[PDB]
Amino acid sequence: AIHVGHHTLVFELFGMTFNGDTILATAVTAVIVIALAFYLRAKVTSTGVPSGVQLFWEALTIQMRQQIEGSIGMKIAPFVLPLSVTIFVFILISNWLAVLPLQYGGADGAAAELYKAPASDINFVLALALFVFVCYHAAGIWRRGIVGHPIKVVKGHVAFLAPINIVEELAKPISLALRLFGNIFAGGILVALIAMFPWYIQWFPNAVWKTFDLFVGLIQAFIFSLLTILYFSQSMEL
Amino acid sequence: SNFLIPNGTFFAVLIIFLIVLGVISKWVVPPISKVLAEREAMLAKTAADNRKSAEQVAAAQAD
Amino acid sequence: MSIFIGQLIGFAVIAFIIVKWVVPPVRTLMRNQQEAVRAALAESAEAAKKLADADAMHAKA
Amino acid sequence: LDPNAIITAGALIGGGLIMGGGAIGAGIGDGIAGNALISGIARQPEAQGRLFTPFFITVGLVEAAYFINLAFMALFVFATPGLQ
Amino acid sequence: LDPNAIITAGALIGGGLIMGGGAIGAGIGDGIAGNALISGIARQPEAQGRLFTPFFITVGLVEAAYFINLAFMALFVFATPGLQ
Amino acid sequence: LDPNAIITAGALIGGGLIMGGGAIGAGIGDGIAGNALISGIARQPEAQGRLFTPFFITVGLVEAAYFINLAFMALFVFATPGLQ
Amino acid sequence: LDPNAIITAGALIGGGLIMGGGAIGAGIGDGIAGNALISGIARQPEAQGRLFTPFFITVGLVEAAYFINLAFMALFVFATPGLQ
Amino acid sequence: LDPNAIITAGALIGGGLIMGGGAIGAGIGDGIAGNALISGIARQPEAQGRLFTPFFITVGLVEAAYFINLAFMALFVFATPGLQ
Amino acid sequence: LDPNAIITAGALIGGGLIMGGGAIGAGIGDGIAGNALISGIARQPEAQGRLFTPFFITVGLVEAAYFINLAFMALFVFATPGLQ
Amino acid sequence: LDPNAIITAGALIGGGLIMGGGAIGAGIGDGIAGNALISGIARQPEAQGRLFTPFFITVGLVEAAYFINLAFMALFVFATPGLQ
Amino acid sequence: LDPNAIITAGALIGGGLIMGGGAIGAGIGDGIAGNALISGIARQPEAQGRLFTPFFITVGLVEAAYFINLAFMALFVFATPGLQ
Amino acid sequence: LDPNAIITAGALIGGGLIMGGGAIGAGIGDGIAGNALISGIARQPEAQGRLFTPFFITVGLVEAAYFINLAFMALFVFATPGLQ
Ligand SMILES: COc1nc2ccc(Br)cc2cc1[C@@H](c1ccccc1)[C@@](O)(CCN(C)C)c1cccc2ccccc12
C-alpha cells in the first residue's frame, strides 16, 4: 500500500482546490528561512567575528555572486543574486526538512508522513519553474526590447536552427520543474517502500537512503539555482 | 485523481515564495553585500596603510 | 507504530553519522573562516597603529 | 476479460521501459561526466573548485531526462491515461 | 473484449518505448557534451564562457529530440491515433 | 476481437520503436559531434567558424536519419500499412 | 480472429525494430565519424579537403547499413512475407 | 482468465525492464568512473585521495539511480499498482 | 486460430530483432573504424594508403556479422523454421 | 489458461531481461575498467601494484550490480512474487 | 490452438534476440579492436606485424561469443527445446 | 492453451534475452580490453609480455558474466523453473 498522491488537508476556496499539506510544508519552510534571515539581520556585523548564520548566508551570497560574475556581470543583473539565493535556500530547506523522523503508521499498514517535501507536489515545482521562466523572459525583454527579445531567442546562436531554439525555450521551464519534482517524488516513494520492512529492519535502509537524500537535496537545490542563473545569463546578452 | 494535475495550490505556493524572496531581497542580500564590500575595503585599506607606513618611514629616514 | 519506531531508529543512525563524521569538518571550516576574519580585523588594527607611529616619527623628524 | 487489466499491464510495461531507458541514460551520462571531472582533477589537482560548476551543470542536464521519465512513469502507473 | 483496451495498451507500450529511447539518447549525449565542456574548462580555465556557446548549441539539439519524442508520447497516450 | 485494433496496437508499438531508435541515434550522435566541436573550440578559439562547416555536416547526417524515422512513424501511426 | 491482423501486427513490430536499430546505428556511427572529421579539421585547416575522402567512405558504410534496413521495412510493411 | 494474472505478468515484465536498465546504467557508469580513477591514479599517484572525492560523488550519483530503479521494481512486483 | 499466423508473427518479430541488432552493430563498428581511419589520415597525411589494409579488415569483419544476420533473417522470414 | 502459467511466463521474461541487463552492464564496465588498468600498466610498468586497488573497487562496484540482478532473477523465477 | 505454434513463436523471438545481441556485440567489439589496430599502425607502421597477434586474440574472443550465440540460435529455431 | 506451452514460450524468450545481453556485454568488453592491449603493445612493443596478466584478468571477468548467463539460459530452456 504505497498510497501515492492522496494529499491531506485538501480544502476548497474561490472555486479552486488547495492541497493543505503542500501549503503547510511551504509555510514551514518559509518560516524557517525568514527566521534565519531575521536572525542574520539581528546578528549581522561587518566589524566583528561573523556568527554561524552570517557565515552561511555570506557563503551562499559569495557562491551565487561568483556564478553571476562568471556568467553575466553583476552590474547587468543584480536581482539575479537575490533570486538565486532565495531559490537555493528555499529548495534546500524544504528538502532537508524531510530528514526529520515524522513518518508513522497509517493505522492501515500504510506509511503516513506528517511533513512531505513540498517539491514532491507538482504545484510547488511548477510555481518555482514558471516564476523563473517569466522572470528571465522579462529580463530578456528589458535588455533587448519587446520585439528584439523574441527575435533573438528564436534565432539563437545560429539562425537556421530556429525550430530547435523554439523547443529549447519550451524545454527550459519543464526541465526545471519535473527534474526537481522527480528526484523528490521518487524519494517520497523510497521511504514509503522502506516502511514496509519490519521495524527491526526498516532502520538501516531508511538511514542509508535519508543520509544520501540529504546530499541529493543539496545537489538539486544547487543545480536549480545554477541553471536559473545561467538561463538569466542567456536571456540577458547583446 | 491524477496527483500530477496542477491545482490552485500553485498560486498559494507562489505567494509564499514571493514573500520569502522579499525578505531575502531586502534584509539578507543587501546587508550581506554591504558586509562583504566593507571587508574588502578594509583589506585594501590595510594593504595601502602598510605600504604608506613603509614609504613614510623611508622618506623620514631619507629626509 | 512499527513504522514510526523503525524510522526513528533510522533517524538516530543518521544523526550519529552526521555528528561523528560531518559536524567536525564543517565546524572546522566555520572556525577557520571566523579566525581568518578575526585575523583580518586585527591586522587592520595593527596596520592603523603602525601608520600612526610612522606619522608620529615623521612629525618628530 | 477486464479491459482495465490489459490497460494496466500495458501501462506497467510502458513504465518499465521508461524507467529502464532513463536509468541507462542517467547512469552512462553521469559516468561520463564523472570521468571528465576525475580526469580534469588528475591533470591539475588544484582545479577541483572550478570544475564542480560545469560538472553539476552536466549532471543537471543528464538527470533532467531521468527524472522527467520518472515523473511520466509515475503518471503511467499511478494515473494511467485512457484507463477505462 | 473492448478493442480500445488493446489499442490503449499498445499506445502505452509505444509511448514507453519512445521515452526510453529519448531518455537514453538525451542522457548519453548530454553526458558526452558535458565531458567535452568539463575537459575544456579544466585545461583552459579562461574558456569558461567561450565554450558555452558551442556546448549549448549541442545540448539544444540533444534536448530537441528528447522533447520532440515527449510530444509524440503525449499524442500516443493522451490522444491515441487509431483509437475508436 | 476487431482486427483493426490488433493492427493499430502493433502499429503503435512499431512507431514507438522507430521513435525510440531515432531518438537514441540522434541524441548520441549529436552529443558526440558536439563533443568534437567543443574540444576543437577549446583547443583553439579561432577555429570556431571554421569548425561549423564539418560539424553541421555531421549533425546534418545524424538528424536526417532521425527525420526519416519520424516520417515513417507517421506512416505507421496515421496511415497504418495493412490496416484492413 | 483474422490471421492477417496478427501477421500485420507482427510485421509492423518487426519493421519498427528494423528502423529503430538502423537509426541507432546510423546516428551513432555518423556522430563518431563526424567527431573524427571535426577533430581532424580543428587540428589543421589543410586537412579539410583531404579528410572528406575517408569520411564519406565511413558514411558510405554507415548510411548504407541504414538504407538496407529501410528497404527491408518496406518488405515487412508493404509486401509482408507470408501474409497468407 | 483472472485479470490479476495478466496484471502480475505485466508487472513482472516491467520490473525486469527496470532492473535491466538500472543494471546497465550502473555498471557502465561505474566502469567509466573507475576508468577515470585508475587513469588518474596511474598518472598522479599522490592525487589518489584527491581523486576519491569526485569518484565517490559520481558513483553516488550513478548508484543512486540504480537503487531508485530497484525500489520501483519492488513497487512493481510486491506492491503492483492497479492490481485488481 | 491458424498456427501459421502465430508462427509468422513470431518469425517477423525475430527477423526484425535480428536486423535491428545487425544494423546497430554494423553502424557503430563502421563508425568507430572510420573514426580511427580519419584520425590517422589527419595526423599523418602520408599514411593514406597504409591505413586501408587494416581498416578494410575491420570493416570486413563488421560487415560479415551484419550480412550473416541478414541471411538468417531471410531464413526467419521467407522460409520459417518450424512452420506448420 | 492457468493464471500460474501466464505469471510464470512473465516472471521468466522479466528474469531474462534482468540477466541481460546485468550481463551487459557487467561486461562493458569490466571491459572499460580493464582498459584503464591495461593502459596504466603499459605506460607505467611499476604502477601495477597500486593500480589493483582502484581496479578492484571499480570491479567491486560493477560485479555487485551484476550479482544483485542475479539474486532478483533468482527471486523472479524460483519464488515468483504474485504467484498463486 | 496448437501449443507448438506458441512454442515456435517464442523460440523464433528468442533466436532473434540471441542473434541481435550477438550481432551488436560482435560489430561493436570488432570495430573497437580495429580502431585500436588502425591507430597503432598509424602511430608505429613497423609494428603492424606485431599488432596482429593481440588483435587476432581480441577478435577471436569477440567472434567466439558471436558464434556461440549463433549455435544456440540454431538450437532455438531448428531443434526447439520444449516442443510437445 | 496448454499451460506448459506458454511457460516454455516465456522461458525461450527469457533465455534469448539472457544470451543477447551476455553476447553484447562479452563482445563489447572484450573489444575494449583488446583495444587497450593493442594500444599498449603499439606504444611499447616489448611490454606485451607483462600486458597479458591484466588483460587476462579483464577478459576473465567479462567472459565470466557471459558464461554465467549461458548457464542460466540452459536452466531457463532445459530445466524450466515453474514448469507445470
Ligand atoms: C533542423 O534539424 C532538422 N535537420 C534535418 C537535416 C536533414 C534532414 Br534530411 C532532415 C532534417 C530535419 C530536421 C528537423 C525538422 C525541422 C523542421 C521540419 C521537419 C523536421 C528535425 O527533424 C530535427 C530533429 N532532431 C533535432 C532530433 C525536427 C523533427 C521533428 C520536429 C522538430 C521540432 C523542432 C525542431 C526540429 C524538429
Residue numbers in the entry:
A (entry chain a): 10 to 247
B (entry chain b): 22 to 84
C (entry chain d): 1 to 61
D (entry chain L), E (entry chain M), F (entry chain N), G (entry chain O), H (entry chain T), I (entry chain P), ...: 3 to 86
Could you pull the original sentences from the published paper?
The membrane domain of the mycobacterial ATP synthase is embedded in the IPM, with the catalytic F1-domain of the enzyme extending into the bacterial cytoplasm and attached to the membrane domain by a central stalk and a peripheral stalk (PS). As do other ATP synthases in eubacteria, chloroplasts, and mitochondria, the enzyme couples a proton-motive force (pmf) across the IPM generated by respiration to the synthesis in the F1-domain of the enzyme of ATP from adenosine diphosphate (ADP) and phosphate by a mechanical rotary mechanism. The mycobacterial rotor consists of a membrane-bound ring of nine c-subunits, attached to an elongated central stalk, made of single copies of the γ- and ε-subunits. The mycobacterial PS is made of two proteins, bδ and b′.
One major difference is that in the prior study BD was well-resolved bound to the c9-ring at the interface with the a-subunit. In the current study, the concentration of BD employed was almost an order of magnitude lower (25 μM instead of 200 μM), and this lower concentration proved to be suboptimal for the detection of the BD itself, as the drug was present in only a minority of particles. Therefore, in the various states and substates (see below) the density for BD is highly variable. However, in the current work, by combining the membrane domains of all of the particles, bound BD could be modeled in the same position as previously reported in close proximity to the N-terminal region of aH5 of the c-subunit in a position that would inhibit ATP synthesis. This position is the “lagging” site. In some reconstructions, partial nonprotein densities were observed at the opposite side of the a–c interface in close proximity to the C-terminal region of aH5 as in the prior publication. However, the densities were poorly defined and it would be tenuous, in the absence of previously published results, to assign them definitively as BD molecules.
